[PDB]
Design an enzyme around this catalytic site. Structure first.
Site, short mmCIF file in Angstrom:
data_model
loop_
_atom_site.label_atom_id
_atom_site.label_comp_id
_atom_site.label_asym_id
_atom_site.label_seq_id
_atom_site.Cartn_x
_atom_site.Cartn_y
_atom_site.Cartn_z
N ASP A 1 -11.47 2.88 -41.02
CA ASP A 1 -13.01 1.86 -40.90
C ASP A 1 -13.83 1.93 -41.73
OD1 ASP A 1 -14.31 0.60 -39.42
OD2 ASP A 1 -14.35 2.26 -37.65
N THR A 2 -14.18 0.61 -42.28
CA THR A 2 -15.23 0.63 -43.68
C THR A 2 -16.59 0.50 -42.30
OG1 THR A 2 -14.54 -2.03 -43.45
CG2 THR A 2 -13.32 -1.11 -45.06
N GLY A 3 -16.00 -0.10 -41.68
CA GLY A 3 -17.25 -0.26 -39.98
C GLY A 3 -18.38 1.15 -39.90
C1 LIG Z 1 -14.39 2.23 -33.39
C2 LIG Z 1 -13.75 1.15 -33.47
C3 LIG Z 1 -12.41 1.27 -33.03
C4 LIG Z 1 -14.21 -0.72 -33.75
N1 LIG Z 1 -15.51 -1.26 -33.67
C5 LIG Z 1 -15.51 -1.45 -34.61
C6 LIG Z 1 -16.60 -0.16 -35.87
O1 LIG Z 1 -16.23 -0.18 -37.46
C7 LIG Z 1 -18.11 -0.03 -35.50
C8 LIG Z 1 -19.28 -1.22 -35.99
C9 LIG Z 1 -20.12 -0.66 -35.70
C10 LIG Z 1 -21.31 0.01 -36.09
C11 LIG Z 1 -22.19 0.08 -36.21
C12 LIG Z 1 -23.23 -0.32 -34.62
C13 LIG Z 1 -21.69 -0.39 -33.71
C14 LIG Z 1 -20.51 -0.68 -34.25
N2 LIG Z 1 -18.30 1.34 -35.82
C15 LIG Z 1 -18.68 2.28 -35.35
O2 LIG Z 1 -18.62 2.32 -34.26
O3 LIG Z 1 -18.88 3.76 -35.91
C16 LIG Z 1 -19.71 4.32 -35.45
C17 LIG Z 1 -19.26 5.84 -36.31
C18 LIG Z 1 -20.58 6.68 -36.28
C19 LIG Z 1 -21.67 6.77 -35.50
C20 LIG Z 1 -22.22 5.30 -36.05
C21 LIG Z 1 -21.82 6.05 -37.41
O4 LIG Z 1 -21.20 4.85 -38.68
C22 LIG Z 1 -21.80 3.62 -37.68
C23 LIG Z 1 -21.74 4.22 -35.72
O5 LIG Z 1 -21.17 6.70 -38.11
S1 LIG Z 1 -16.78 -1.68 -32.63
O6 LIG Z 1 -16.73 -1.10 -30.79
O7 LIG Z 1 -17.70 -1.71 -32.96
C24 LIG Z 1 -15.35 -3.30 -31.74
C25 LIG Z 1 -15.85 -4.76 -32.75
C26 LIG Z 1 -14.85 -5.54 -32.69
C27 LIG Z 1 -14.39 -5.91 -31.61
N3 LIG Z 1 -13.27 -6.21 -31.32
C28 LIG Z 1 -12.69 -6.02 -30.04
N4 LIG Z 1 -11.77 -6.96 -30.05
C29 LIG Z 1 -10.42 -6.53 -28.54
C30 LIG Z 1 -9.61 -5.86 -28.65
C31 LIG Z 1 -9.52 -7.48 -28.70
S2 LIG Z 1 -13.06 -4.98 -29.15
C32 LIG Z 1 -13.90 -4.19 -31.10
C33 LIG Z 1 -15.02 -3.50 -31.02
#
Ligand SMILES: CC(C)CN(C[C@@H](O)[C@H](Cc1ccccc1)NC(=O)O[C@H]1C[C@@H]2C[C@H]3[C@H](OC[C@H]31)O2)S(=O)(=O)c1ccc2nc(NC3CC3)sc2c1
Ligand SMILES: [Cl-]
Ligand SMILES: [Cl-]
Ligand SMILES: [Cl-]
Ligand code: NA
EC number: 3.4.23.16
Lengths: 99, 99
Positions: free
Chosen positions: A25-27
């Site tokens: 997870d690069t994000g």
């Molecule tokens: C958690 C993963 C699995 C999904 N997400 C992408 C993820 O890269 C997210 C992206 C993100 C970064 C920062 C804030 C909010 C979201 N990363 C994330 O939460 O990491 C956390 C980790 C820790 C605490 C902090 C710090 O860095 C950022 C944050 O360290 S998401 O929730 O932002 C997301 C994005 C797009 C998306 N498209 C989706 N499509 C639906 C399934 C069909 S579900 C979904 C969820």
């Protein structure tokens, strides 16, 4: 290896003697793993994702094996819906994004 | 480019003639942008992650430039904490993970 992004980039990890599936997870700044026991000291942390914040336990100096590559770093443990390998460990295995 | 992960993989995007910053995010299935106006009709979606979920507006077939690379695809708009370029568009720019 080269991992395409047509599907989620899931790998097997070994952490705390356990095998788990986790997302590269690069994000993610940090690595976040579902509830499990780890040895040693921890401190609480709040971390924000897309849906707001969760409370986690922060464990430092944890060894991990990510798709066969060892490293060491901080691991956050708590109610994440997905196990995520964040940049703090992706750097250590030499992962890059290329286009 | 080859992007290492010692810092967040932020790039400039262009959407609706305006420049924004966004995260190249291999952990995101979909692309999610902060509130903005886009043309056409939208459909509902929910996207979940750490913390729970947000309700977004789904716009299809939107012209978007990512780090200078032209894409045309689905953009979700809603109350995300960060602009995220997910795999739907990372595959359009030819991105892979490598280690
Ligand atoms: C958690 C993963 C699995 C999904 N997400 C992408 C993820 O890269 C997210 C992206 C993100 C970064 C920062 C804030 C909010 C979201 N990363 C994330 O939460 O990491 C956390 C980790 C820790 C605490 C902090 C710090 O860095 C950022 C944050 O360290 S998401 O929730 O932002 C997301 C994005 C797009 C998306 N498209 C989706 N499509 C639906 C399934 C069909 S579900 C979904 C969820
Ligand atoms: Cl670390
Ligand atoms: Cl390096
Ligand atoms: Cl798309
Ligand atoms: Na420790």
């Amino acid at each position: 290896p080269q991992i395409t992004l047509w599907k989620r980039p899931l790998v097997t990890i070994k952490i705390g003697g356990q095998l788990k599936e986790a997302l590269l997870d690069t994000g993610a700044d940090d690595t976040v793993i579902e509830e499990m026991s780890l040895p040693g000291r921890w401190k609480p942390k709040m971390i924000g994702g897309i849906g707001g914040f969760i409370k986690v336990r922060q464990y430092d100096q944890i060894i991990i094996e990510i798709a066969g590559h060892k490293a060491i770093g901080t691991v956050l443990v708590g109610p994440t819906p997905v196990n995520i390998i964040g940049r703090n460990l992706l750097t250590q295995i030499g992962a890059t994004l290329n286009f």
